[PDB]
Amino acid sequence: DQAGKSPNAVRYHGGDEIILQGFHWNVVREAPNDWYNILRQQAATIAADGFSAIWMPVPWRDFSSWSDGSKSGGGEGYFWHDFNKNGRYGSDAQLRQAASALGGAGVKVLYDVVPNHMNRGYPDKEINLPAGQGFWRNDCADPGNYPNDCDDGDRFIGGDADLNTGHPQVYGMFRDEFTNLRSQYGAGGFRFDFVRGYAPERVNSWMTDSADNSFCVGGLWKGPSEYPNWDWRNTASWQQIIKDWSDRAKCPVFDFALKERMQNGSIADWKHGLNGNPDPRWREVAVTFVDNHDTGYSPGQNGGQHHWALQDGLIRQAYAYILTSPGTPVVYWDHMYDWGYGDFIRQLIQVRRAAGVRADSAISFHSGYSGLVATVSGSQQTLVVALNSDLGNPGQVASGSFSEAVNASNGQVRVWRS
């Protein structure tokens, strides 16, 4: 495990990570208080599958609850009330065992942290911040979903649960918890939640103070049309918007540019995600994914959230693309362990590693065929990737002696290594 910072000091940890999102939206409903026991038990498997890191659910207990017609949710971690680790995923004790088992097997533990808001209203909690002290966004005049004097970012829905993460005491509180996660819960890094909610610069601060040399990733889902008309971002590409967050937080960022192309364009247009960017300083900070707990389905109730789900006819192509290309790939728990894509994914992980493909590896796109046709310059081998293409042989697009590495879905997924 190579471990440095990128050339622009972004915390990509060697640019060689392969991450597993370790949960789906309905875990708290399907394996109540049993999730950490399940991970402990699966640690060796996760490690053998080839993952170098795992994105853990929020560790802070969440006993929230909501209902919206047929829709229902709560307890998943995004509306926590305390730093107490005895939540719906399992106890503190189990968490410790789980992180220890993962860590021992050589899988880094990345915690999902939610600094933007908390469950203000929860009656029995250990963290009680009174009103009128500047701790809350709503301590200030709250015009609309725009930064206010009590919160330098967007608000979460109503904004009544928004924290002034910039308040010296609120900042300090998060900072200590981050340090706590690293020293007693074996944190090798963090996934920063709802990043649009507070300044990017705060994320760099936090990382600097508690885990400067760790891995970090920001979850920024905000399209151009959500910025004010006068803002440059209102006219920028998805790529520019996320790259800008990354420059400021000094953390890799989820590639929502690739996700939007996967949902709205053709497979040939997948080349316009951050990860396909010709400048290595651009593509290396991209954290690729096919679906997450928000965008995809989940086993159980209501099929989870499925806000921007990738259709099944493209799941193999999508994994083939992310696992063989630049940026840092993320595998969704369900595709891997629930839905039967596990074998195919395992094969690609092996291909990626044998080729020595990394965050900054070069990628070239070949124009004369149908589908996506790309040449990837791994540090050990060159890969030719042809997805839903009329390409006949790797030699039509690259110099060298190629061997078939992968051939799935009636040749819709073809990968060759030199």
Ligand X SMILES: OC[C@H]1O[C@H](O[C@H]2[C@H](O)[C@@H](O)[C@@H](O[C@H]3[C@H](O)[C@@H](O)[C@@H](O[C@H]4[C@H](O)[C@@H](O)[C@@H](O)O[C@@H]4CO)O[C@@H]3CO)O[C@@H]2CO)[C@H](O)[C@@H](O)[C@@H]1O
Alpha carbons 20 and 47: distance in angstroms, whole number = 10
Residue 161 sits in the site that holds ligand X (CB under 6 A): yes
Give the nearest distance from C-beta 99 to Ca ion in angstroms. 18
Q: Using CB under 5 A, which of 1, 149, 201, 312 touches Ca ion?
A: 1
Residue 153 sits in the site that holds Ca ion (CB under 5 A): yes
Give the nearest distance from C-beta 273 to Ca ion in angstroms. 22
Give the nearest distance from C-beta 79 to ligand X in angstroms. 4
Residue 151 sits in the site that holds Ca ion (CB under 5 A): yes
Distances (CA, A) of 251 to 30, 139, 237, 287, 377: 33, 30, 19, 10, 24
Residue 294 binding: pick among Ca ion, ligand X, none (C-beta 5-8 Å cut-off by kind): ligand X
Q: Which stretch binds ligand X (CB under 6 A): 39-47, 71-79, 132-140, 228-236?
A: 71-79
Give the nearest distance from C-beta 326 to Ca ion in angstroms. 15
- Which parts of 350-389 interact with Ca ion (CB under 5 A)? none
Residue 58 sits in the site that holds ligand X (CB under 6 A): no
Alpha carbons 246 and 354: distance in angstroms, whole number = 29
Cα 102–Cα 106–Cα 111 angle in degrees, nearest 5: 50
User: Which CB sits closer to ligand X, 72 or 235?
Assistant: 72
Residue 149 sits in the site that holds Ca ion (CB under 5 A): no
The Cβ-side half-sphere exposure at 303, using a 13 Å CA radius, reads 7
Residue 256 sits in the site that holds ligand X (CB under 6 A): no
Residue 157 binding: pick among ligand X, Ca ion, none (C-beta 5-8 Å cut-off by kind): ligand X
Q: Which residues pair with 332 in a beta bridge?
A: 21
Give the nearest distance from C-beta 145 to ligand X in angstroms. 11
Residues 6 or more apart from 283 whose CB is under 8 A from it?
Answer: 274, 275, 276, 277, 326, 327, 359, 360, 363
State the amino acid at position 162 in one-letter form. D
Residue 79 sits in the site that holds ligand X (CB under 6 A): yes
**Cβ-closest position to ligand X:** 158
28 Cα distance to chain centroid: 20
- Which parts of 175-234 interact with ligand X (CB under 6 A)? 193-194, 219
Q: What is the sign, positive or negative, of the torsion defined by CA atoms of 381, 385, 391, 392? A: positive
Residue 241 sits in the site that holds ligand X (CB under 6 A): no
Distances (CA, A) of 78 to 81, 87, 119, 145, 350: 10, 12, 9, 19, 34
The number of residues that bind Ca ion (CB under 5 A) is: 9
Give the nearest distance from C-beta 296 to ligand X in angstroms. 12
What does the longest C-alpha to C-alpha distance in the chain come to? 70
- Which parts of 272-311 interact with ligand X (CB under 6 A)? 293-294, 305
Span between the terminal Cα atoms of the chain, in Å: 24
Give the nearest distance from C-beta 118 to Ca ion in angstroms. 11
Q: Using CB under 6 A, which of 18, 39, 54, 114 touches ligand X?
A: 114
Distances (CA, A) of 367 to 271, 319, 385, 391: 11, 21, 13, 11
- Which parts of 74-133 interact with Ca ion (CB under 5 A)? 116
Q: Using CB under 6 A, which of 128, 132, 157, 225 touches ligand X?
A: 157
Alpha carbons 416 and 375: distance in angstroms, whole number = 10
User: Which CB sits closer to ligand X, 141 or 157?
Assistant: 157
Residue 78 sits in the site that holds ligand X (CB under 6 A): yes
Residues 6 or more apart from 263 whose CB is under 8 A from it?
Answer: 308, 310
Distances (CA, A) of 334 to 90, 187, 232, 300, 361: 20, 23, 37, 11, 28
User: Which CB sits closer to Ca ion, 168 or 368?
Assistant: 168
User: Which CB sits closer to Ca ion, 164 or 377?
Assistant: 164
Residue 13 binding: pick among Ca ion, ligand X, none (C-beta 5-8 Å cut-off by kind): Ca ion
Alpha carbons 290 and 295: distance in angstroms, whole number = 9
The Cβ-side half-sphere exposure at 247, using a 13 Å CA radius, reads 8
3-state secondary structure of 392: coil
Binding site for ligand X (CB under 6 A): 64, 66, 73, 78-79, 114, 156-158, 160-161, 193-194, 219, 293-294, 305
Binding site for Ca ion (CB under 5 A): 1, 13-14, 16, 116, 151, 153, 162, 197
